[PDB]
Amino acid sequence: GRLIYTAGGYFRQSLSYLEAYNPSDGTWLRLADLQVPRSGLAGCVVGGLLYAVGGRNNSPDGNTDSSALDCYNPMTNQWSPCAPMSVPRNRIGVGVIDGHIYAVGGSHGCIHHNSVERYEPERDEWHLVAPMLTRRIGVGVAVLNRLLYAVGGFDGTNRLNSAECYYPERNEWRMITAMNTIRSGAGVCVLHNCIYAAGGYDGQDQLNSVERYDVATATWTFVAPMKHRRSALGITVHQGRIYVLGGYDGHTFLDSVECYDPDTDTWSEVTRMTSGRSGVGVAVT
């Protein structure tokens, strides 16, 4: 009975919400708020614990980029602070390999990071690894074949269709085949041995198009588009299906949750979040 957790987000200002959706019965739980309101963060799970990584506190009286790492225990309904990252990372990408959290790119004020760091929960320590070949904020991250893929984003000048792959054993990055579409703030996940990149911003419009990377052919192929165009959407995989949560369509902050069935190549609206928001962190446990 795993749940889809959504942490933080943005609607007029950064949000503290921690909510959990049950795809089986369609119910939503209201869990303990984040200690600091954050948008542009990422979520991940290690050993049944939910982690909220980086982001930014956007408030009417001023803004603060976050280097924070916070851990939520579903059994206790409590958030606990962890060691912070070396730098603040807003619009961060995150992936997990062997119980270690990789924090990828993101921004700190005018700085667009190419730097990458890894967290060890057993030691509560962060350590820098090899930086990416490109500076990437609003970057999508996917773990596939024990490699860490960094997809699209924004380098400070241009939104990107480029993508690269990290080899943990060799501690190095290599560029892979570029996507068909330029995407910053896309939802990036892994489903049935393929990397999916859904929505995002091409530098002009928020996108509803969805493409998938097949490792064997090293090609990106378009699949069925989402019903709603969205950037800064949350994404996850639950029981062989992709779930996209909220986002921004250029005018509205979406409460829509769409579900992709790979067997039928179709998207359907499954639920609505309690309120519209973009820039959430999402994970399943």
What is the spatial distance between Cα 14 and Cα 58, in angstroms, rounded to a whole number? 5
Q: Which residues bind a copy of itself (CB under 8 A)?
A: 10, 12, 59-62, 64, 91, 107, 109-112, 137-138, 154, 156, 159, 184-185, 201, 203, 206, 231-232, 248, 250-253, 278-279
Angle at 242 between CA 201 and CA 190, to 5 degrees: 80
**Nearest-approach distance from CB 235 to Na ion, in angstroms:** 22
Give which of Na ion, a copy of itself, none residue 9 binds (C-beta under 5 to 8 Å, depending on kind). none
**Nearest-approach distance from CB 28 to Na ion, in angstroms:** 23
Angle at 200 between CA 176 and CA 192, to 5 degrees: 55
Closer Cβ to a copy of itself, 39 or 165, answer by number? 39
What is the spatial distance between Cα 278 and Cα 285, in angstroms, rounded to a whole number? 21
Strand ranges inside 155-274, DSSP E: 159-167, 172-175, 187-191, 194-198, 210-214, 219-223, 234-238, 241-245, 256-261, 266-272
What is the spatial distance between Cα 93 and Cα 132, in angstroms, rounded to a whole number? 12
Which stretch, 51-59, 94-102, 214-222, 231-239, contacts Na ion (CB under 5 A)?
51-59
**Nearest-approach distance from CB 201 to a copy of itself, in angstroms:** 4
**Nearest-approach distance from CB 110 to a copy of itself, in angstroms:** 4
Is residue 27 near Na ion by the rule CB under 5 A?
Answer: no
Q: Judged by CB under 5 A, which of 59, 73, 78, 193 binds Na ion? A: 59
Give which of Na ion, a copy of itself, none residue 93 binds (C-beta under 5 to 8 Å, depending on kind). none
